[PDB]
Structures are given as C-alpha cells and as structure tokens.
Amino acid sequence: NSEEDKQYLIFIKVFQQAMKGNFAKIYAKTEEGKDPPIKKKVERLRAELNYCYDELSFKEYLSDFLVRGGLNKYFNEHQEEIALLIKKSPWQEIRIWSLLAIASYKPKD
Amino acid sequence: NSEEDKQYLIFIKVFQQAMKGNFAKIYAKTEEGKDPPIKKKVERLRAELNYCYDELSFKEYLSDFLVRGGLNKYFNEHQEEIALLIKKSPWQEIRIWSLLAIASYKPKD
Amino acid sequence: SEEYVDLTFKLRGAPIPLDNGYLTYAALSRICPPLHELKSIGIHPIAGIPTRNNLLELTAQSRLKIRIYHQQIPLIYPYLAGQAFHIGQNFYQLDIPDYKPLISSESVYSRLVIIKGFQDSTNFIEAVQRQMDNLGIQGKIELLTRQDGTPQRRQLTINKEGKQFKVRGFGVKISELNPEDSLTLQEQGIGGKRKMMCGIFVPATRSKEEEET
Amino acid sequence: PNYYLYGTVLTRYGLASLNHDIRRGNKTILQKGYWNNGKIHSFVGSSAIRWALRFYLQKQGYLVNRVWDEEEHINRLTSEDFDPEKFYDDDIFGFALLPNQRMGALGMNMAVSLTPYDGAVKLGAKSGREKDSTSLHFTEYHATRYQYYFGIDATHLKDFSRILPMIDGIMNLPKVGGSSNIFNYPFCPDSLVFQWTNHFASYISYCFEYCDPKSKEAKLSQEFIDEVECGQIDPSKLWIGGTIVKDLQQLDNFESSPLNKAHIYRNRNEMIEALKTVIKRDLGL
Amino acid sequence: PNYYLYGTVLTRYGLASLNHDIRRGNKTILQKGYWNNGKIHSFVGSSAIRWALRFYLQKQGYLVNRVWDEEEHINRLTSEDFDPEKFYDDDIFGFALLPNQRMGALGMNMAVSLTPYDGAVKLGAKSGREKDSTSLHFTEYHATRYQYYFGIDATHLKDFSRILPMIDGIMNLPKVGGSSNIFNYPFCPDSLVFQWTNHFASYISYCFEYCDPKSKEAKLSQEFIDEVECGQIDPSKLWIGGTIVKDLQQLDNFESSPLNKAHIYRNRNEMIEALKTVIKRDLGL
C-alpha cells in the first residue's frame, strides 16, 4: 500500500544490503585476534552522513556508498524506483531515511 | 489491541534502548574518579528535544540519537512499522512520545 | 618556479657507468613510448658514490630525476610509476614518484653541455653566451676546471646502431642571474641534449661536489 | 592608542594541492567553494597558515608552548598551564583548554584562489601490498595565486615587541600543510597591501583580484583603487609593495593619483623595514 | 521635536562564520533561516551587533556600566544600579534588572545574508596522531555580505549629544562576535542608506539586493527606488553613502530621477560629516 512508502522501504533494504556488503569487506580486511572495527565503522558512517552541504554533496556520497557496498540484489530488481526516488525528494529526507536504515540493519545479523 | 498503540509502545521501548546505548557510551567515555554526567546529559537531551523547528529539525536529531544508541533489539524486531511511524505522523506527537520515553526509561534503571 | 616540476624516482639496482646518458634514455624510451616524442623534457644526472672503473654505485640518495612541464606529467606518470627497466643486462626499479619544485639560486651549474661544432673552450663560451642572450638571460660564464685548472670536458657515448658517436662538452657555471632569470635558465637550460641527460642546470653546490672529485 | 595592522598578502603563481578534503571515493578533492561572479574557487584553510606561523615561531627560538616534533609528528606542551606572558604562541594565537582562554591577537581568513578552479586533476598511483600492486587514484591541483586577509590587534599583545617577529614569519612562512603539499608551494608573499591604522574600520580585505585565468598578472581590484581615490583609506596609513607596485608605477596619472602618496616600495624588504620603524616609533619599542 | 534616524547598512564581502546555533555534533551551524524568495539565508544576531557597538564605546574612552574584561572574558558592572544619565551604555542600549528598566534608544534588526546560503562547511584537524575527542571538527562558513536595518529614537536619549559616538561606532564597528581566529570578517560598512526625519513611519528597510546569486553585486532594490520616485521618502531627508553610489550614478537618467536630489556622497566620511552637521543643527548642539 501507499507506493511511495514502498519505495521508502525498498530504499531502506537497499541501504542495509549495501552496508552488509561493506561490513563483509572490512571483516575480510582484518586478520588475527584484533576486534574488527564495526562500532567505529558505524560511527564513521554516521559522521560522514552528517557531513554534507546539499545536492552534489551526500549524493556522490550515497552513490559511492552503494558502489562500495557491492552488488545489491534489491537495487538490481528495483533500479528505476530507487533511482527516481534518489533523484527526487529533499536530500535531508534521504539522509534521515539513511540514518533510519543505519539503525535498521541489525536484524540482518 | 489497536496496533497503532502497539507501535507507539515499541517506539517508546526503541527510544529507551537508544538512550541506554548512549548512557553506556558516556559511561565508557568518562575516566578517573570524575562523576559521569548523567543528570547533565539527560537535561541536555531534554533541552535539545524541546529545541526544534519542524520536519527536518528534530527528525534529523531523532535519527542521529537512535544511531548514537547503537544496537537496539526492539527496533530490530519491527522494521517497517517503526520506519513508517517515523516517516509519517506529525513531528510534535513523536516529540511527545520521545519525551515520555525520557520519563519512562528510568524503569530500566 | 612552481610552473615546472622535477619528477624524482627512488632508483635502485646495479652500478652504472658514469657516461650512461644514452643507456638510460634508451631504456626509458623502451619502457615509455611518449618520452621519445616530448620536447621540453630533461633528466638530471643520477647521484651516487663512484667506483674506480668509471662506474657509479647507487646509494640511498641516488635517484632518477626528470624535468618536465606540469601539463605533460600524465603522459609520463603511467609508464614510470612503480615501473622497472633494463640497462643492458642490469635490472633497475623505480618507486612511486615524488614532485620537487624548480627553486632559484644565486648561481647555477651544468655538468655537461654540448653544442654542435664547438670543441674549443673559447668558442664554447661564445656559443653559450649566444644561447644565453637568446633566452633573455644575464650572467657571467665560467667553465668548471679540473685539479689542474684545465677546463673539464665530459664525453657522451651515443651507441646508435652498430657504431657509436662521440660528443664532447664542457661544464658551465653561470652566476649573478637574478632569481627570475635563474629560473628561466634552469627550465630552458643550454645545450639542447636534455633528453640526452646533459643540459639540465642545478644550483651551484653540485658544482663544488664535482670539482672536489 | 588602540593600533591595528590589517593586510591582504598575495602569493606567487604555482601548483597547489594543499588542503585536501574528505576525498570522496578516489580523488583528493581540493577545498573549493563559491566566490565572486559565482565561479568555483579553491581555498586554503586559515588554520593551516596559523600552524605554519606557529612552526616558524618555534623554529627561531621564540619560546613556544607547542613544539613540533618533526619526527613523531606530536605536539608537546612545554608547560601544562598556558602563560601568554612568557610564550610567543599563547600570546599571539591564544588558546582554549576546556583557565584564561586567551582571545588571541592574530585574526586570519582563508586564502582564496585568484582564478576560478576549472579542471586540472592529476594522476596519482598509490602502492599496494597485493603482490606489488599499484591502484590509480585522482588528485586535484590548481595553478593560481592565493591571497588571504589577516588582522593584528597590536594592543592585545601581552608584549608589544612580539609584533615584529610576526611580520617576519609572514614574509618567511614555512611550507604549509607539509606532507600533503604534493607540489612544494611557497607561501611567502610576492605583493603586500598593509594598512597600519588606529581605528577598527578596515577595508582592503580582498583588494587583490585579476580574474582572466589565461594569465597571472594579479592586478588590483577597481573597488580598492576607487576606495583609495575617494578619500577613505588615508594614504599615509597605506603600505603597498611587491610586483604589483611595478604594474602600478607604469599606470598613467599615477603621480597625480592619491595612490602615489601612499607608502609604496618596489622591494618588499624596504616595506618591512620602514613599517617596522613606524611600529617601533608608535609602540615605544 | 521628535527625531528619528533610520538606516539600512551593508557590510563588506568575505567569508564569515559569525553566529552559530547549537553545534549538532561537529558543525558550528551558521545561524540560518528562510528569507525572501524562500531560500535559506544565514543570519547575524542583532544582539551581537549591539555587543560590538557597546565594546566600541568601551574602547574609545567614554563611560560604560558594563566593562568587557578582555582577559577574564567576564562582564563587570561599574555600579549595580544603572544610571542612563551618566553612562553611555545604559542610556543607549537600555537595561533590565528583574528600578527603571528604560526602553533603549537604539533599536536594531537582525542581519541577513545578501547571498543565499547553500553549503561551504570547513574542515578541522590537528597536528597528527594521539587524536582525542577534540581532533575532528567541522565549521560552516558563508561567502556573502551581511546587511541589516536599524533605527534610533534620538529624543529618547538622556543626552542628545550621545548620538554622534553611536554613528562613529557604526562606521568603525569592531569585530562582531564570531570565529575571528579563522574567519576574520570586517563588519565595517561599505554602503549606507540613512534617513533623518521626524516621522515614525520607517521605510528604507532592507533594500540592498543581490543582482546575481552567488555574487557580490549588491544593487539597490527596485521597490525602494520606486518608493523614492513615487513621492514618499523625501530625498532631502535621504542620506546615501558607500560603494552603491557608483552604481547609482551609472544608472540612466539619474539626474532626472528624484534620487539625484537626495544627499549622496561616494565617500562615506564626507556623508557622515554632513549628517552629523545636520543632526547637530537639528538638536541645538
């Protein structure tokens, strides 16, 4: 119901999957008994999300984050909807959705 | 009963768990015999919650505070419901719920 | 000043002859095609501790330094960054390059300058003066001398094809340039064989370095 | 008498990669923003210039609280308590502990590139442990001259004689940034515009401007010339010098113009000596 | 007779970070809000300008109840009981005890940014290594020229002669509260529109307008010029001085326009002297 909220939820899932890919990458990077930096990574992600100055800033950032996440199956099935949602809507709203997704990824694992 | 009220209660719990995470963070940050600022932190949180000027303001703050809370299980269980509740609803009612949560985290400790 | 850059590479490998101009130029052109057609490029002499058999032992401060316009670096950086080349049967490796500015100094110096058809010292001074005027430069011309005081000639062996040609040159020291003209001199140089590892000018301390030994 | 020394100093043309930003994905983007006429210009943080001045002060004696190790890259405090009376650094730049929280005599603004930043990305390959791998990344560079603005509250200094080393440090500013300054870009000024007055009102904030990126002549803004000619900016309070004076002296009507009676010198050191004589006269040094 | 001096004043172009709201987590947010045409403009608090004027009155001698320590960063009261008759500060700015509570002769409006504010947040690192909670910090800045309007009830002044030092301070305004260590923004006016009249009706509010977003043109609003031409805002009571004078004189048919009959001076000091002469005439000083 309420198709725009469907786009919002699939954006949430896309962001969660991209950050899952990024987490897998950084887990792969570390080795031996040192605790892999993840809470620190979450703090860095939040801080970089907070740092932005409208339009191009934070949009290049979201695109780069989605790229470094890897292959996003939800993005693959929902290319057009996600792209149209990203191009439209105030960037502050997209940042708020991204922060909610930041707090929404934990049930994945 | 009245699933909207269920979502409201679980949102109260989510905010409580986020403030628990931030309390753990500040307790970790403090050092030596200095008294960890908790009353000061709670009053600061309340003052920043009262300070807000619609939509982007206080919603960015809500998302940032939830992220600062870190791992929160109550938000993990229910993704779409809380995500839609945050995106929808007038921000003032969300402020009421968050303030209540401020007054109702103290049951936990 | 900063409008021209000296590309420096930490160079390591086998010891090298002290007249290695064409050898290193040919190796670099082998591993870098675009170097063979550029115009305003030049290579600084490779420092080190020499040996008894007219060979130089590369040290930690030994490095390959290339003078280039900043608007042509992307044509050379891909083929030299981290790249390795062979001089004969010797292996040479270059690290990640670093950029060094073109600083002005009160006096300058060149290890080896050659101009076609000038072997005697006096006519060489006259020709270096002529190229000196052609660049709008002011200064006085001196020739670096051996322990005997005789002007020191240096020789470049271009081993083109089966044969090899001989070109003899002089070390030229020019002082009282004024920093703008000094920069113009270091960037232009005199001799033309800057790809041939001759015409690059350097501050005057290296002149003392070469005059001591 | 509350004396103030404001000035806009201009640097020499060259390549700049000084104060790179967050480096979005691969390019060390140069710190850029919007400026006159709405064209993107590259900036240099004023805090970098303040750090360079502090390093210069620490180099040549001048007891300073913050010592730059130059090897371990760690600032060490000579004394825990800040004492601006004894240290040049605390007296000049102030401090904040979070004691006294000195306001700081020197004020600075970020350096703005004379010409708009158009293109000029450079190829930079960083090494990798993956079987000697080299991954190519990007780095922005700009060929321009940076001008910046600064103000000195001479009366605010605990020791009035400490102003003299500051002008020398501005003239002999060390390398800005250090490691990330890919191309060694000097910040010793090549043309100065100094106003040593006794009232808070201060023009000449960004007098230098040429635009026209095809060249690097670094002319003077028509607004500053008009402000000088009108009657404001008393010429006896104006100190001008550098390569810009060479251009100014060639101008017609220069002798008749009120710009002539302003203290003007082709050589920068002549400015520095004459101005320092003026300061030592006015401050009873 | 009651006399009122109203004025819209525009500052100089530059980089400013004067006012900060709440410091979200790392940025010192420039005081911003919606303005004309519905795009976010940065703001400078009128209380900061009042503090700057009070500090000016403190510096150039004069008597002030509140003294700015400049060393303890604390405000001290010469007398616990305020007295507008003696002190310039209490007479001009008023006071609340919570006595007399006054009203305050000077009334000022908040300073808006001529240019819409989009982005431009500054970095903020520190030496290297041993990084603590204070290592990383961002800072917002705006490249614009701030402008605001003010108005003063001269008759309300306990001493009528105190109006002149206020105008002098408005000319030579000291630093306005902000990060002057890294963002030194001179708040000295470069264009003035003053009205000295005996009516409460105060036109000539924010009139300076920006010809091009992201630029520094600062032309004069069409509504203000139309108001002047239509008959209201008597030109004999109009006092224009600053850089806008050149733009006004380059306007076509300016001589035929009623604006030419207004008191215009390209030099600011000449217009200030003429205005102060007129004020002294009309107040019997």
Side-chain angles (χ1 to χ4, degrees), chain C residues 169-194:
Chain C
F170 296 81
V172 152
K173 175 166 181 297
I174 311 175
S175 302
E176 314 88 23
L177 304 314
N178 153 29
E180 167 268 340
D181 272 351
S182 182
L183 293 176
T184 317
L185 197 44
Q186 323 186 45
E187 163 295 335
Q188 301 296 142
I190 296 175
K193 304 285 195 190
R194 266 160 273 292

Side-chain angles (χ1 to χ4, degrees), chain B residues 11-71:
Chain B
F11 166 84
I12 272 178
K13 283 171 189 164
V14 163
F15 201 90
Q16 289 180 19
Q17 170 65 312
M19 151 194 319
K20 183 186 209 190
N22 269 297
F23 283 175
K25 174 173 306 317
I26 173 58
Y27 270 109
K29 193 162 210 273
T30 177
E31 94 295 1
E32 309 163 339
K34 279 273 170 155
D35 183 359
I38 298 304
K39 198 163 187 185
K40 301 259 233 186
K41 195 33 172 73
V42 164
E43 295 214 281
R44 162 165 171 70
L45 183 40
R46 173 210 141 291
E48 302 177 307
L49 266 194
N50 271 326
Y51 160 79
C52 34
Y53 31 99
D54 215 352
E55 201 50 26
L56 324 187
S57 156
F58 154 81
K59 207 173 288 294
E60 272 195 289
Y61 191 77
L62 183 68
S63 58
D64 217 303
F65 186 54
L66 296 187
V67 171
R68 261 187 176 82
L71 266 279

Side-chain angles (χ1 to χ4, degrees), chain A:
Chain A
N1 41 42
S2 38
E3 83 305 333
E4 70 290 14
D5 319 58
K6 308 174 194 156
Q7 324 309 333
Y8 160 74
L9 290 168
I10 85 188
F11 172 83
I12 288 309
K13 284 173 191 150
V14 157
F15 194 91
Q16 290 192 35
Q17 191 58 38
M19 88 180 337
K20 186 167 187 172
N22 275 300
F23 289 176
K25 279 185 158 59
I26 166 175
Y27 273 71
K29 280 163 189 169
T30 173
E31 87 296 333
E32 159 277 358
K34 31 196 204 161
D35 159 9
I38 284 305
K39 174 199 62 184
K40 258 182 56 186
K41 180 50 191 276
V42 164
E43 182 79 321
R44 167 144 57 256
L45 196 32
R46 186 284 298 285
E48 262 172 358
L49 261 204
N50 175 25
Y51 166 84
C52 36
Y53 31 100
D54 163 48
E55 273 319 275
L56 299 322
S57 83
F58 166 86
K59 284 288 201 37
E60 319 206 331
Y61 185 74
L62 201 51
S63 61
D64 290 8
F65 185 74
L66 288 212
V67 152
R68 308 318 271 256
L71 291 203
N72 263 344
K73 330 167 310 302
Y74 304 110
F75 189 36
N76 294 342
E77 329 312 315
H78 319 94
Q79 299 288 353
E80 304 73 11
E81 324 168 86
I82 279 311
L84 205 59
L85 173 63
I86 289 286
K87 165 254 176 185
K88 97 175 172 206
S89 312
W91 63 272
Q92 305 88 322
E93 291 309 89
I94 290 116
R95 172 162 59 176
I96 297 202
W97 304 339
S98 306
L99 271 196
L100 301 163
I102 288 284
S104 295
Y105 166 79
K106 324 158 179 146
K108 191 80 62 189
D109 267 292

Side-chain angles (χ1 to χ4, degrees), chain D residues 109, chain E residues 14-18 30 44 140-144 146 179 183 185:
Chain D
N109 250 329
Chain E
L15 310 164
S17 292
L18 309 178
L30 206 53
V44 179
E140 292 201 303
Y141 69 93
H142 193 6
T144 173
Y146 288 107
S179 75
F183 287 107
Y185 197 67

Side-chain angles (χ1 to χ4, degrees), chain C residues 1-5 70-71 73-74 77-78 81-82 93 96-97 99-101 104 179-180 183, chain D residues 12-15 121-127 132 134 136-137 141 143 182-186 216:
Chain C
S1 173
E2 322 93 300
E3 334 179 7
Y4 276 85
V5 201
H70 88 107
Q71 290 204 88
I73 309 174
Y77 189 102
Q93 165 54 2
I96 298 314
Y99 303 89
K100 282 299 174 327
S104 73
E180 167 268 340
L183 293 176
Chain D
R12 213 189 191 168
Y13 194 87
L15 324 171
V121 72
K122 83 166 281 274
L123 267 298
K126 72 172 182 175
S127 166
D132 181 74
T134 64
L136 264 176
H137 74 266
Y141 75 96
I182 300 332
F183 320 86
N184 279 345
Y185 193 59
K216 34 185 177 300

